[PDB]
Amino acid sequence: VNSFSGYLKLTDNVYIKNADIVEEAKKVKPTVVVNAANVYLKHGGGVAGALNKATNNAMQVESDDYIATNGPLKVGGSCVLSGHNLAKHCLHVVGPNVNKGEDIQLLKSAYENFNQHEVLLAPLLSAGIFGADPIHSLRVCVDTVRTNVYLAVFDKNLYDKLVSSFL
Numbered sequence: 001v002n003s004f005s006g007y008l009k010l011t012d013n014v015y016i017k018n019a020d021i022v023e024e025a026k027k028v029k030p031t032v033v034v035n036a037a038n039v040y041l042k043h044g045g046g047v048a049g050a051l052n053k054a055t056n057n058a059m060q061v062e063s064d065d066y067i068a069t070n071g072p073l074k075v076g077g078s079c080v081l082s083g084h085n086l087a088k089h090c091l092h093v094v095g096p097n098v099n100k101g102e103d104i105q106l107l108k109s110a111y112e113n114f115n116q117h118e119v120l121l122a123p124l125l126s127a128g129i130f131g132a133d134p135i136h137s138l139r140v141c142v143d144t145v146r147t148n149v150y151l152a153v154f155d156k157n158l159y160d161k162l163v164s165s166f167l
């Protein structure tokens with residue numbers, strides 16, 4: 001038993017809710033919140049900009065130190081950093097950004113990072129400003145992630161479409 005409330009169950013291990021991932025994290029304080037990161041960990045907009053703003057820019061400060069030490073992530077890769085006031089940990093995961101021409105097949109590799117964590121609060125990778133089809137992102141998620149994932153979908157109209165079209 002865990003503290004996520006109001007989710008619709010899609011599969012054995014994937015759940016979904018129309019919610020603001022920032023507000024959900026602020027209320028649940030999950031062990032892991034996933035950020036929709038880029039390889040530079042520049043949290044300017046979309047989910048990343050919102051999560052970072054909610055940390056009062058502490059996420060960005062920590063991220064800049066991480067990059068200065070380690071260099072950029074790979075598309076499809078991830079790193080674990082602090083969750084600040086939102087979660088114990090933040091898993092920064094880089095899905096491919098279609099608006100940069102990145103190979104959509106890397107989306108499966110991106111979701112594989114979730115399997116290293118027993119339970120996660122997460123957005124749909126490569127959705128939103130990353131330019132992928134969210135219906136496809138959900139199919140890859142369901143077919144790749146084996147751990148328990150609670151997906152927060154900000155847009156109500158999109159949430160209803162994701163549910164109504166789910167096979």
Ligand SMILES: O=C(N[C@@H]1c2cccc(O)c2C[C@@H]1C(=O)O)c1ccc2[nH]ccc2c1
Nearest residue numbers: 021046047050123124127128153154155158
């Ligand atoms: O950019 C976000 N979300 C994406 C989005 C936005 C508009 C239409 C979309 O289809 C999508 C897919 C993504 C998702 O829902 O994960 C997002 C998330 C939480 C937020 N809180 C405060 C600002 C804010 C923005």
